[PDB]
Design a protein around this ligand. Structure first.
Ligand SMILES: *[C@@H]1O[C@H](CO)[C@@H](O)[C@H](O)[C@H]1NC(C)=O
Lengths: 49, 96, 49, 27, 48
């Protein structure tokens, strides 16, 4: 928990529909951006803890 | 005397400050109206298309409402400033 | 353009972007010119008439 | 400029303003 | 200071925004009142 990993991801393409169609996730609340309008955007850097 | 008036008008432009100040005040009025678009007014971003491209409607309504409130209030401020300066220029036109 | 949406006329510009500059910004915090994400070319965004 | 703000031209431009002043001066 | 010392920052920010919104409306009403009163005073001064 305290030693949380941080993976910097760059130069890739992600569809994010894998996060939708998978029902194993019991917690999925996105805060600053709508996750459905994600594949039509592009961002500088993305970090995955 | 006509030659002296011509010489003074050719020498200095500071006499026409009574028009330069009005032109300048209009300039900062429109510049204020331009630069007040860049303010967030509590929103996450000041660009309307950026707000539209990021968010679903259930939060986009709130963010766009904040942006509209700030921009409209800034505009109403500009409107009252233009109205009182129009009253000034009205009195000036009456005197002229 | 990379998630930046808007409506305008895309014309070839004569602006001298530095190689690390990806877009231009106007006075009113509006997009003035952009660099194409696929072609190393400079295009100005003029709003429609 | 492109944010919906426009400048409307005056009804009397500088030419007819100068003509009015010329008429006043001559009279 | 009471708001800052009492509430957590996420709600304290909303309370501060409401307070400064009311205060700026009060300020702009006062300023416009001063502007119209100064217009009246300037007209009286021109008459004098
Ligand atoms: C997009 O494709 C073109 C054609 O294959 C290529 O020249 C260009 O480099 C590509 N864009 C990027 C950012 O690599």
């Amino acid at each position: 928990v305290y030693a949380w990993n941080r993976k910097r991801i760059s130069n890739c393409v992600a569809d994010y529909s894998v996060l939708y169609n998978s029902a194993s996730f019991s917690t999925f609340k996105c805060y600053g951006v709508s996750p459905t309008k994600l594949n039509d955007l592009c961002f500088t850097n993305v970090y995955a803890d | 005397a006509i030659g002296k008036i011509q010489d003074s008008l050719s020498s200095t432009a500071s006499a026409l400050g009574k028009l330069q100040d009005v032109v300048n005040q209009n300039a900062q009025a429109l510049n204020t109206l331009v630069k007040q678009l860049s303010s967030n007014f509590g929103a996450i971003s000041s660009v309307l298309n950026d707000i539209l491209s990021r968010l679903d409607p259930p939060e986009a309504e709130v963010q766009i409402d904040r942006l509209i409130t700030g921009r409209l209030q800034s505009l109403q401020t500009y409107v009252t400033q233009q109205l009182i300066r129009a009253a000034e220029i009205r009195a000036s036109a009456n005197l002229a | 353009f990379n998630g930046l949406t808007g409506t305008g006329v895309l014309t070839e510009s004569n602006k001298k972007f530095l190689p690390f500059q990806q877009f231009g910004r106007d006075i009113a915090d509006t997009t003035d010119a952009v660099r194409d994400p696929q072609t190393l070319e400079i295009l100005d965004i003029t709003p429609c008439s | 400029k492109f944010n919906g703000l426009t400048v409307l031209p005056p009804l009397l431009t500088d030419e007819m303003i100068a003509q009015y002043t010329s008429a006043l001066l001559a009279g």
